[model samples]
Target: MAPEVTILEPLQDVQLSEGQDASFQCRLSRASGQEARWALGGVPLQANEMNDITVEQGTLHLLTLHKVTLEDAGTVSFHVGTCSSEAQLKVTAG
Candidate 1:
C-alpha cells in the first residue's frame, strides 16, 4: 500500500469582523529525513513564521494570516519539491 498525506486547510467562508484575526492550517507528511521547503500563495514562508508548524510525526503545518481581510480568500498552495498541494477558502468581511 502507498502512504497518505494531508496538506492545507479550509479558510473559506470565514467570517471575520474586519479587526478579527484569522488563521489557516496546513498539514504535510513524507518519509522521515526528507528535507523540504514551505510556501504560501506561491511566496516562500519564513522559518520564524513556521514556529507553530508541525504535524503528528509528519512533515508539514502552516499558520497563515494573523489578521482577517477580504483578500485572504481563495486557494492556498503548499508546495513540496515537484509536487504541489492546495486548499481553498473564502474570507468574508464582517
Candidate 2:
C-alpha cells in the first residue's frame, strides 16, 4: 500500500487583531516524500512565494503571516496528496 497522508493537526478558525501575526500549522504522518501545499481562498501558496507570507516544511507544515490585515481574512486550505483540510481566518481591526 502507498503511504497515505494523515493530518496530525488541522487548522482552526482564528480571530486576531490587525497588525498581529497569524500562524497556521499542520502536523502530518506518513507524509515524507509527499508534497504539502497551503492556499488562501483559492490561490496556492509556495515557499518564499510572497513578501509577507512564509511557508515552512519539516515535521510540521507551517504558514505564517507577518502582519495581518482585513484583506487576509479568508479560508485557508492545506493539502497533502489525497488528504486535505481547511480553516478560516477572521481578522479584526486593530
Candidate 3:
C-alpha cells in the first residue's frame, strides 16, 4: 500500500497585503517515505523568489511566499504522498 502523511493539518485561508509574506506549514507523515519528492518537484514552487519552501527533519514543512504582489493572490497547493492541501491567499493593496 502507498504511504500517507502522518498528520495533515488544515491550512486555513490567509489574508495579506502587497509585499507581505504568507506561510503555510504542515507535518510529514513519513519523513523518509515522502522524501522522494523533496529534491524533485517543479520550477514554479521553486520559481525564483516567487515561492519559498522549507523542509526540516521531514517534519517541519513550511511553504512561504515573500515579496508577494497581486500575482501571488491565488490558491496555494501542497502535497505529501497523495495528500493534497490548499490554502487561499487573499491579497489586498498594502
Candidate 4:
C-alpha cells in the first residue's frame, strides 16, 4: 500500500516573534513499514544541527528554530521512503 502521511500542528498562518521556539511535525504510515528522513532546504538532517529533531513512532519532528531567527523561515520538506510509501513536508513562515 501507499504511504499515509499528514502534518499535525500549528495549521499554518502561525505567527511568532523573534526568539520564539518553533517546531514542525510530520507523521507517516505505510504498509511496507515507514522509514523516514528529513531535510531542510534540500540538506539532510544529519548534515545540520539536529539537537531538536527526532523520529519516533512514525513521526518526524523538525526544529524550526532554536533561538527563532529569520533564517528559519522557509520550506522544510521531508521524505519518508518505504517499499511502497512516501511523504513530504512543505513548511513556510512569514
TM-score of 4: 0.50
lDDT preference between candidates 2 and 4, better one: 2
lDDT of 4 by residue, 3-92 (tens): 344434343445565556766554444335455456556767453463365556655454544665666555554455432222332334
**Candidate 2: worst-modelled 10 consecutive residues by lDDT:** 47-56
Best by TM-score: 2
TM-score on alpha carbons, each prediction? 0.48, 0.68, 0.63, 0.50
> On lDDT, who's better, 1 or 4?
1
The per-model lDDT (C-alpha) reads 0.52, 0.66, 0.61, 0.49
Better of 3 and 4 by TM-score: 3
Residue 15, model 2, lDDT: 85
In Å, residue 73's CA in model 2 sits off its true spot by: 1.4
Residue 94's C-alpha lDDT in candidate 3? 68
Q: In each prediction, how many residue pairs overlap at the backbone (N, C-alpha, C within less than 3 A)?
A: 3, 0, 1, 0
Error of 1 at 39 (Å): 1.8
lDDT of 2 by residue, 3-81 (tens): 6666676456778888877776666655655676756666885545332443346555556567566776788676666
* Deviating ranges (above 4 Å) for candidate 4: 1-14, 30-34, 47-51, 58-64, 80-94
Model 2 C-alpha lDDT versus the unseen true structure: 0.66
lDDT of 3 by residue, 61-94 (tens): 7766677678756765555565555556688886
TM-score of 3: 0.63
